[PDB]
Amino acid sequence: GEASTCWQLTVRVLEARNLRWAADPYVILQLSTAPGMKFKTKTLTDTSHPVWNEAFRFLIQSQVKNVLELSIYDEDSVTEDDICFKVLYDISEVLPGKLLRKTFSQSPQGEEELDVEFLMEETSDRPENLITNKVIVARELSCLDVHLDKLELELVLKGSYEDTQTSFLGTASAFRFHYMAALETELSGRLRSSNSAGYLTVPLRPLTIGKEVTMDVPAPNAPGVRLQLKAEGCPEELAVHLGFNLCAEEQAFLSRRKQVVAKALKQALQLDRDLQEDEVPVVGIMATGGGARAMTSLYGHLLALQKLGLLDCVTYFSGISGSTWTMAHLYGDPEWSQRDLEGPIRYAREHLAKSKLEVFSPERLASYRRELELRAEQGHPTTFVDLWALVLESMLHGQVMDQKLSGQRAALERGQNPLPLYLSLNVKENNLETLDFKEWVEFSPYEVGFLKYGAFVPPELFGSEFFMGRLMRRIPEPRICFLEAIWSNIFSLNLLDAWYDLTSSGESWKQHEPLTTSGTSSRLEASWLQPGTALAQAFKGFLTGRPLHQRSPNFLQGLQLHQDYCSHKDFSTWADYQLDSMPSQLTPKEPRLCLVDAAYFINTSSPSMFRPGRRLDLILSFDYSLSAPFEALQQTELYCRARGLPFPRVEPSPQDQHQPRECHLFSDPACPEAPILLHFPLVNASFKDHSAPGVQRSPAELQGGQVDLTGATCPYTLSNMTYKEEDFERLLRLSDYNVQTSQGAILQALRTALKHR
Structure with a gap:
């Protein structure tokens, strides 16, 4: 049982140089401690020296190991995209307040380079409730329930364990998503059939308190379907025993x-x-x-x-x-x-x-x-x-x-x-x-x-x-x-x-x-x-x-x-x-x-x-x-x-x-x-x-x-x-x-x- 406060990281992807020709390059950002949350820059066309200048933001828990993956891919509409650049970066190097400019290089003689800047800043959020044995960490977990009063309902919650859940109407009554309280993410909902109806999104802000929303998901050629959802703290009890002594x-x-x-x-x-x-x-x-x-x-x-x-x-x-x-x-x-x-x-x-x-x-x-x-x-x-x-x-x-x-x-x-x-x-x-x-x-x-x-x-x-x-x-x-x-x-x-x-x-x-x-x-x-x-x-x-x-x-x-x-x-x-x-x-x-x-x-x-x-x-x-x-x-x-x-x-x-x-x-x-x-x-x-x-x-x-x-x-x-x-x-x-x-x-x-x- 431990309380620890999160920081905000801004990652600014500037440009890359000397990339290999087919390139149509875009950058992917993944954080080891935010599975299912990918960021993607715009794809540039026929450059080999792309300049994106795009910034992305993560909530970072200082008490866990955070490895940021930065990968450059070459876009091709026919085949799966080839990777032309990959670096893994331990962000513990980035100290709060001090902007860190980084140029990442592939190989000792490798000529490919990626320019990125990192800024870590304090936030005013409450501390996260962690559980550890000092090697493994259980992050604070939130739980969100969706209840429902042919069509297929699709629910998506990026960063959750379930990620996506689908169901025909009548065939599914209720849904549960588990996800980290520290995520900034959203639940999106929509109805599909064999014109497509609009999707609804409910934002999920980091370390929020429980809440209760009702919304009507529009159907194609039919009236809205009423869903009720409530996000709540998951109970802080684990089925997995964490400790280095005998039970x-x-x-x-x-x-x-x-x-x-x-x-x-x-x-x-x-x-x-x-x-x-x-x-x-x-x-x-x-x-x-x-x-x-x-x-x-x-x-x-x-x-x-x-x-x-x-x-x-x-x-x-x-x-x-x-x-x-x-x-x-x-x-x-x-x-x-x-x-x-x-x-x-x-x-x-x-x-x-x-x-x-x-x-x-x-x-x-x-x-x-x-x-x-x-x-x-x-x-x-x-x-x-x-x-x-x-x-x-x-x-x-x-x-x-x-x-x-x-x-x-x-x-x-x-x-x-x-x-x-x-x-x-x-x-x-x-x-x-x-x-x-x-x-x-x-x-x-x-x-x-x-x-x-x-x-x-x-x-x-x-x-x-x-x-x-x-x-x-x-x-x-x-x-x-x-x-x-x-x-x-x-x-x-x-x-x-x-x-x-x-x-x-x-x-x-x-x-x-x-x-x-x-x-x-x-x-x-x-x-x-x-x-x-x-x-x-x-x-x-x-x-x-x-x-x-x-x-x-x-x-x-x-x-x-x-x-x-x-x-x-x-x-x-x-x-x-x-x-x-x-x-x-x-x-x-x-x-x-x-x-x-x-x-x-x-x-x-x-x-x-x-x-x-x-x-x-x-x-x-x-x-x-x-x-x-x-x-x-x-x-x-x-x-x-x-x-x-x-x-x-x-x-x-x-x-x-x-x-x-x-x-x-x-x-x-x-x-x-x-x-x-x-x-x-x-x-x-x-x-x-x-x-x-x-x-x-x-x-x-x-x-x-x-x-x-x-x-x-x-x-x-x-x-x-x-x-x-x-x-x-x-x-x-x-x-x-x-x-x-x-x-x-x-x-x-x-x-x-x-x-x-």
Whole structure:
């Protein structure tokens, strides 16, 4: 909540020189913080050195980043006009009272020039009512309602979210426009039919008070139609949460969870006394990706922690890609960590064992089609992610699984499970420049949002349409398989490569394990994925046109960047330098997101462990890579170091790399702020010999420790979705064993974590 006064900017477009020949030039002015308000000079004819001398006026909010775009176009009545000049200008340079004369130049030797003058002046308006977290700004919003007592009515309000609304008489009763209170704009109204009637305009002055007008819109060959409109302040309450600390629900959860942790810690460490709230260490589990391999192994890791009584000591549980499948299934049961994990294990084993060719029955394929047809009619886009959602759902459960992310709040109501954190990356879609622009989007049962912008919504509202932090249109929360599809949409790319011989136009390639018996990649080889299947036959053609990634409505839409967003600790932490220094090119102005599996970039769920407020003391890092078990940890360390996030050195010895063990400690006692890391690579070491911690195995039971992690015919390759129960059990029991045998190291780390707190 903040009051801030606006200035008036006069932009005088004088002249340009040395423009390229066809020119018939005109200048366009756009302001990044006034979308839909374009100014246009007159078009001059056959000059190459145009002199316009036209002035235009904007209301400017000093507390937001304001980028003025000045573009010169060459007018052509036949083809779309070519741009001959473009500059982006941060108007914070222009100081009030002092006329600033500017000559803009294109290139270092570029000969084209544009002369402009800027004057910033004070106004007598009241201050604007802004809401910020000091990086994102919600501008003051006004709301205007139009009510009405064949003909088509057209209502236009330049600068509003809706912009233009049309309707036949009778067919539309009422209209709402949302627009910034700081705009000088107007509502224009007119009636059209198949002589044209005159239009009426009602001016909308900046920061005005509510008002009420009645006017009669003239019809063609018929009498006037009476409309009533009232402009009012929009209520100053946002559906989007703006702030860089934990939300109320997560804070409340922590108090609940820390009681369960304090108790479980006392029992596990055989502690003398009861732990004070401030002494309870914050422990996190952090899982990487790796399809069904990650899913299976993570089940085993959780079983171990349960048996050791250490699962109750865990506060946070983060994951990406295949790990989210384990998480999603478990958090469907509100009591999962308090119940024998062997039940969910069995469920997963049986579904992973069934034939994935016969799962694609005609009934099932028809159901996919029917569902996608309905979704399309409902106005959802159709992408690879949508099909992958339904197929993945079928493989994991064999039926529609009507559970939602918001329903996972029940699993946290008594602090009886850890808080689950699911990660994805927001990317720019179909833009060959900006390939490595990437923003972490965190999902939990309490909120979904951007770590960089400090902006979140409840999961039930993710996918709904927003403007300036307000909910514009509520879309029903999807089934969890649709989120699982986003989280693991590396499989959308694998489906695309396996199905389509892309020697083609689509340059959405993105294009990111033990080789086969043929010496080829194991990536695109599993039964379900092959080009001749019932699945492919039904859907290969259907999917041809379509994007790889979901086109999710952006809940940040219309929000603006604060004037000093760059010099904010948390934005700076997450900022991709070059693109992030360009505020007009940031995510808030996009109507849509493009959400991608973290496995496209970096195979870690660690960013959620470093959101401000979480304060992790110990992290159990589970890594499911089949090669390079330290790669993910090392990249995350570099990633953290570049952003000034305290994290221990990850310096395994040559011996460690040659033969990794079940558990590696990475910890820097010199820096207490940095968390302790216990890292569990996917390796079959002592388990080859031992059926249990410190227990050798009967020769009969030698087969149980023969886990095929390395040769060709490795059944745990990324795309394989069919595990023989034999192979499932080995991976699961290996994972279980590797954690159990490390009990000592975990308890030691817990003790150290305790001392530090």
